[PDB]
Symmetry: D2
Subunit: 362 residues, 4 copies
Amino acid sequence: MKKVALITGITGQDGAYLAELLLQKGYAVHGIKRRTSQFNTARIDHLYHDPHEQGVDLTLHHGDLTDTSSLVRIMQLVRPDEVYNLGAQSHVAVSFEEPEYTANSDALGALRLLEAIRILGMEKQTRYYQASTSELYGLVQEIPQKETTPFYPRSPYAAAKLYAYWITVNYREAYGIYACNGILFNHESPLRGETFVTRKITRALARIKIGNQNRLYLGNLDSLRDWGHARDYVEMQWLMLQQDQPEDFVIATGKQYSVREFVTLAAKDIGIEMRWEGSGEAEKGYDAKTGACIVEVDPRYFRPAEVETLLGDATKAHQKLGWKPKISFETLVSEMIAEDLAAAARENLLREHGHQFFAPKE
Amino acid sequence: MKKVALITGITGQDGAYLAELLLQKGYAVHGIKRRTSQFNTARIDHLYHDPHEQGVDLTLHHGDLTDTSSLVRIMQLVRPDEVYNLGAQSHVAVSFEEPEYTANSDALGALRLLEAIRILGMEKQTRYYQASTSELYGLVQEIPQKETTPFYPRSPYAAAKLYAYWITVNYREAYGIYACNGILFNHESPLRGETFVTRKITRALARIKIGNQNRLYLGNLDSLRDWGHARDYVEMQWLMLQQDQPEDFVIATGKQYSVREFVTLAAKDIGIEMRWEGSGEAEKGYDAKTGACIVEVDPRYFRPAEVETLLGDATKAHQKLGWKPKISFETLVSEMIAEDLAAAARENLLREHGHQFFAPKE
Amino acid sequence: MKKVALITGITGQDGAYLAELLLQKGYAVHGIKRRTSQFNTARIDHLYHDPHEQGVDLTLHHGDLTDTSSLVRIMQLVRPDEVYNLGAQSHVAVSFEEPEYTANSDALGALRLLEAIRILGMEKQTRYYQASTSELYGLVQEIPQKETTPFYPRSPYAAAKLYAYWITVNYREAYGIYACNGILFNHESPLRGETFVTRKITRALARIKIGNQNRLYLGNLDSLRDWGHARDYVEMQWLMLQQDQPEDFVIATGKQYSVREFVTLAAKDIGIEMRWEGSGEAEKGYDAKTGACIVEVDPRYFRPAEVETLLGDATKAHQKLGWKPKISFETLVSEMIAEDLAAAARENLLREHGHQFFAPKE
Amino acid sequence: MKKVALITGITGQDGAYLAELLLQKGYAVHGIKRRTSQFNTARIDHLYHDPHEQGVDLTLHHGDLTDTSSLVRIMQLVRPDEVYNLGAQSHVAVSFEEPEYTANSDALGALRLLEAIRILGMEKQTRYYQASTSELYGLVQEIPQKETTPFYPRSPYAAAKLYAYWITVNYREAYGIYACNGILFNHESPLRGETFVTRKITRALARIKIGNQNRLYLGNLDSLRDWGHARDYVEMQWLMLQQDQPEDFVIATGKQYSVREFVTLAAKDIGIEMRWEGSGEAEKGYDAKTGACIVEVDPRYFRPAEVETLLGDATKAHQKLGWKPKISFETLVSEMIAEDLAAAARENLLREHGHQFFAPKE
Ligand SMILES: NC(=O)c1ccc[n+]([C@@H]2O[C@H](COP(=O)([O-])OP(=O)(O)OC[C@H]3O[C@@H](n4cnc5c(N)ncnc54)[C@H](OP(=O)(O)O)[C@@H]3O)[C@@H](O)[C@H]2O)c1
Ligand SMILES: NC(=O)c1ccc[n+]([C@@H]2O[C@H](COP(=O)([O-])OP(=O)(O)OC[C@H]3O[C@@H](n4cnc5c(N)ncnc54)[C@H](OP(=O)(O)O)[C@@H]3O)[C@@H](O)[C@H]2O)c1
Ligand SMILES: NC(=O)c1ccc[n+]([C@@H]2O[C@H](COP(=O)([O-])OP(=O)(O)OC[C@H]3O[C@@H](n4cnc5c(N)ncnc54)[C@H](OP(=O)(O)O)[C@@H]3O)[C@@H](O)[C@H]2O)c1
Ligand SMILES: NC(=O)c1ccc[n+]([C@@H]2O[C@H](COP(=O)([O-])OP(=O)(O)OC[C@H]3O[C@@H](n4cnc5c(N)ncnc54)[C@H](OP(=O)(O)O)[C@@H]3O)[C@@H](O)[C@H]2O)c1
Ligand SMILES: C[C@H]1O[C@H](OP(=O)(O)OP(=O)(O)OC[C@H]2O[C@@H](n3cnc4c(=O)[nH]c(N)nc43)[C@H](O)[C@@H]2O)[C@@H](O)[C@@H](O)[C@@H]1O
Ligand SMILES: C[C@H]1O[C@H](OP(=O)(O)OP(=O)(O)OC[C@H]2O[C@@H](n3cnc4c(=O)[nH]c(N)nc43)[C@H](O)[C@@H]2O)[C@@H](O)[C@@H](O)[C@@H]1O
Ligand SMILES: C[C@H]1O[C@H](OP(=O)(O)OP(=O)(O)OC[C@H]2O[C@@H](n3cnc4c(=O)[nH]c(N)nc43)[C@H](O)[C@@H]2O)[C@@H](O)[C@@H](O)[C@@H]1O
Ligand SMILES: C[C@H]1O[C@H](OP(=O)(O)OP(=O)(O)OC[C@H]2O[C@@H](n3cnc4c(=O)[nH]c(N)nc43)[C@H](O)[C@@H]2O)[C@@H](O)[C@@H](O)[C@@H]1O
């Protein structure tokens, strides 16, 4: 019959792309949405577009990863075949300011879902995906990082995810629940949250190009990341729940780029050749042709403990799942720059027609 | 020197209006904001508009009412003279779906702030305002309701707020902390959350008038509420912290209107004379001139236990504070209808210029 | 067939007496016990005494009122016909030191149990008793206090209990769950915790008479309490769950005595005629015959906000349940004094035979 | 000038031994004690014995590891130079029944203490010890296990401890707080909780020898453990806080014994030579001389996921700290058997003199 999926974090980047994929595969899709003082469904509102009157099997439920009652209620109501725990306080910098809330959401949240499956007698009915992460590798102990690279978390977010990784393994080993860990490396999109580095860059460059913004302030320009596109990555989240046995998989492109390179690439798409002068906190990025200063370093964006370099070896995912990234880095950055230009243009169009719009800033 | 205020719930309706008021009074204003996967500051983004380059003393901090560590950290960092606990899971209908999260945020959240003042030795420095509510009267034991009317909660939200009312009273009596309860009756605005009844109505009527929406579905049409404007009410929140002694005050207009009356008034503002035909769940609201069906009843919007009527006697606030509502009900409904028309018009302008916009729905 | 009862707080005073009563009535009795680093079942160990080899249907489960998963797991496993929420951080003085933990256990704990009944679909099978309390009346608004006397909490314990009272009322009214509030006034026994005032007195007097202790230090000697015996009161807890409709009942003796009177009565049973000289913090109690100082006042035992007098009108319980206290105040105090002498004697017997025993102190 | 120590879990085995050690070293010792419905200080009551009237600088505070407010209050009140986080839901089997409570106590509890040190500005005043454990190695990846052996948790307790290990490392690296992890292997004593395997065996064998108990029921007899004496290990907890730099250390004897061996050794001390007949769940242990059945296997004591073998390489602690176990395995087992015999004799003495005592059982 119709497959039922329950997605926590459905309003986030991955949840949006995953809901779309599962709707297109014919699922009855349910999402756990936080109560919010305003609409917070901007990433998925388009999924309710139904011109043919065919019907959209998308259902949103109020709950919170800190609230076991709400999670057990929704699990009981929905009775899903597949649970995707994508919900999280997902920002590493913020986890230094809210470590307890982050642990409660990201570590105990997974336990609550797994314990709900056990309490409700769903061990043979429900498959469970945990949104694990390359942040587990932190101060990397091998280069590249694979499934067997020992973990070394460097933030309260990664410590919390490490718990969720191991509580997922424990429920698989102790109880036989189909529970697995997607160890996904950084993946971005035009739906990426605005204060993560890639979206912050493409958003600042777009508004600098239009003229609504003056400067882009960044932190560690030397930080190296394996960056993919979220549309490719959520497909591996679905596929990992379709296998005969539950297993953990690294998902990654196998190439890493620095924050400096990301700025330089993204600046090209808006017609700026970046020139870098200076070292450390003094380093600055300039438009080569005009001489204008585009990028400066603000140490307020350094993290208390940095993860300097991530690079994933997804050999096993390639062999067992056929993992191959379809969207390339350069394609990713162009889509993000184009989408952010359009957003800045939509804000100019409003102000051109006498409607006020005041932009948000971090 | 400069007065320091800390506002929880600063991204909400009251928090936005209170931040504006306190900025204009010269405060250094600090808000506690939840981590969110998107920008969620649309109610206060305009407050950073600074054409004269004078500077805006508005600071946002990441924290959560369920996280004691984050609240003590911010309280310790900010050291405010005035704390306004406006943050809450504030929707009564949702509190039946997330009673535990609601209790954790709305009841224990207030304790965490008060206990932080005590632990940090701030009893003689910090005055505390608790966002109490007319929901405490629930199944009303007197009509009208005043400060001495016994409480009777009817939802997990009001049960939680009742705790926060008394823990605030207790810390005032046990420890001598300046802690008081604004017992505020329903107050609305163009910043009201879209799923509360008044904003749901004005938003639905605006989009029906434009033609973007077909029908408005409501629950209990007979529910009676004392409705004021949030801009008037937040002024009394500030004033209650300026007194010689801490005291609890009912704030209310003294007149109540039904949900049916609200639809009728708001439809009148868009040129529709409502005609009501039918009883109970079969009751429907029609355009008298065109005959078109505008409003129907869906039992899905009933609450498990209803609060049927609220009406506040704010005599004591009038005598001691000079409380007198400046904005009238009819003005409030007009301002809300105009703003929702403008918002729907901004979305048509986007689609008229080839930009896609998909609207959210509850 | 066999009735199933679930008792939180089974290791406490009421839980021990209630477990015994329900075992004698033929129940399958289940208790939620906290994990403890030592055996903590001394109040109920005797219930496992089975010389006739009949069998004792007493089962203990690990859980905690702060842990929703543990409560739902146990509720799912046991599927009880009757739930008695006796578990609590029950000490008023401690609630000023641990207000948050007290709220989480005493307020949210009851919600977790009620929400488990609803989530598990047990609304038509399970009846729920909430251990409400005369502490709700706090700064008493009527003398005597009855079901309709408005509440006035005076500690973080009473605030937390007030929430649990109203969430019990709300689940009854909103969902039709058989849930009621026993508004029980103070009840004591030889199993009373050692730092509550009556047991502190009888324990100190027994050890003073034997010679193991020198002086009894107390706080507010003028505090007035309606004191009954827990063995009578747990019978009304059981009976309230046997009625046709769920209802809240005050249970009380209808007479109150002061702390000073309790000392004087309890001292009389060990052969000491108390004579009181002095006022306030200087007041002291002496043995009339020997002149020795037995009682002094230590302000360290005052509460930040005191409840000065409690006196219950249990007319409705008398009329509707046949509530009549069988054990009198004087019988209660004699039984408490006898048990504390016996305990002090069992400790002297150990040391006389070369076994060391070191007694605990507050 | 007097050194101040704060010990969570002071009523537990290690806390009792650590309190004694620090009192002898001249500390002002503070413990966090849970509110309990009875006295729960039996492990430390003897520490208040003061024959010379010199004074005992031991202070107990009410708090809970699940309650951030109570922890910050105590940290603020006590302002210790050394914090020892020994408090925990420490039983591995129970953690499968209360995984969430265990996570809240054992994982987030450590964070709450570390975050309190940071919020209160104590980073340069306070050293922090985390009670990490050989359970982190779980499904051991190296034999023997050293500081660099990768972790592999096998229970919700170890998953929770793994979080607390890494949040301790993270606060050391991100903030420079003197915070270290004692990775202690199993250590026992006569104060060991009665349901851990070693104390369950010695307690059951003593009562079997006296004749008060018939049979000892155990689970996995093949489990291998590196067993030391808690009195030796708490000395290393103190010493790890006296070094120049914070560092993590394995503490272990370097020899492992099986559960079967422990029974056999302990039975010898009560004059029973164990003979084992059978395999697996049919395996039974008999008195070789009398033929009586002493030990049987009950699968109810199996854990859902077992830790089969632990063996510690404490080379680094030996080289840097001078670690050498002073008390041997045989000495530990003899001491535990003697105390359990003495305890069982005290219970007969009570019943021999006409006093009732009903013993507890797991
Ligand atoms: N992006 C990457 O490169 C990457 C890599 C590896 C792993 N991951 C993990 O994969 C998941 C998806 O990432 P993402 O990029 O989609 O993150 P995201 O954009 O920040 O989405 C987070 C989602 O979780 C929700 N959420 C947060 N706290 C919650 C709570 N207490 N209860 C319920 N829902 C809560 C958010 O709701 P709101 O919309 O209300 O805030 C949002 O829907 C996360 O767990 C993330 O940590 C991400
Ligand atoms: N409006 C009325 O008529 C009325 C009447 C009486 C009393 N009150 C009370 O007065 C307060 C203000 O009302 P309002 O209309 O401004 O409500 P609102 O629009 O719903 O604002 C609630 C605010 O609290 C924040 N919040 C929610 N849960 C939180 C959590 N766990 N941690 C931290 N912040 C959290 C929300 O953040 P997000 O934006 O991220 O969701 C938002 O900023 C509320 O406490 C409400 O219950 C309101
Ligand atoms: N006694 C009275 O006169 C009186 C009057 C009115 C109402 N009440 C209420 O009636 C109930 C019974 O009173 P009582 O005298 O029996 O109290 P008690 O002797 O202090 O018993 C409290 C029980 O609750 C357990 N408990 C505490 N915290 C818990 C938690 N977080 N999770 C699970 N269990 C927990 C305790 O376990 P431990 O043994 O491990 O501590 C104990 O079994 C309480 O709710 C009390 O407030 C009492
Ligand atoms: N024993 C070993 O071989 C071993 C080896 C490695 C690591 N460890 C760890 O080292 C520590 C000490 O072990 P142990 O044998 O002394 O354990 P234990 O006998 O079980 O002591 C645990 C202590 O923590 C307290 N506690 C439990 N939950 C608490 C909470 N929520 N809030 C506050 N206090 C709480 C307990 O109080 P009550 O008395 O009220 O229950 C008790 O004082 C534990 O963290 C343990 O897991 C032990
Ligand atoms: C893999 C990991 O990716 C994301 O985790 P992060 O929060 O680490 O990713 P982000 O893209 O924000 O940062 C990556 C690297 O960029 C550096 N950086 C430099 N300047 C800036 C700046 O101004 N802002 C931000 N946000 N980062 C900056 C950072 O120091 C860092 O090294 C989340 O999606 C997690 O949920 C996920 O687990
Ligand atoms: C006073 C109280 O006001 C608000 O509390 P409420 O949640 O009760 O206000 P709301 O405006 O949502 O409802 C008032 C009355 O309208 C009836 N109603 C009828 N049809 C609908 C419908 O479709 N949607 C909603 N939301 N309500 C409907 C409800 O039954 C109710 O009786 C919040 O701001 C609280 O935080 C605050 O404490
Ligand atoms: C009704 C209420 O009774 C109990 O609540 P309490 O905590 O109020 O009862 P307790 O017996 O401790 O105190 C009653 C009155 O005695 C006064 N008092 C004087 N000297 C002392 C002293 O040394 N110790 C204590 N504990 N109290 C002292 C107190 O100030 C107070 O006025 C618990 O069972 C609750 O759970 C229950 O809800
Ligand atoms: C190291 C670790 O030691 C302790 O952790 P554990 O809970 O694993 O120690 P325990 O002594 O309970 O068990 C050790 C081994 O004995 C086996 N076993 C066999 N039969 C029984 C039985 O009847 N009861 C118990 N309790 N265990 C039994 C178990 O399967 C296990 O393999 C705690 O102190 C932790 O906090 C600490 O971190």
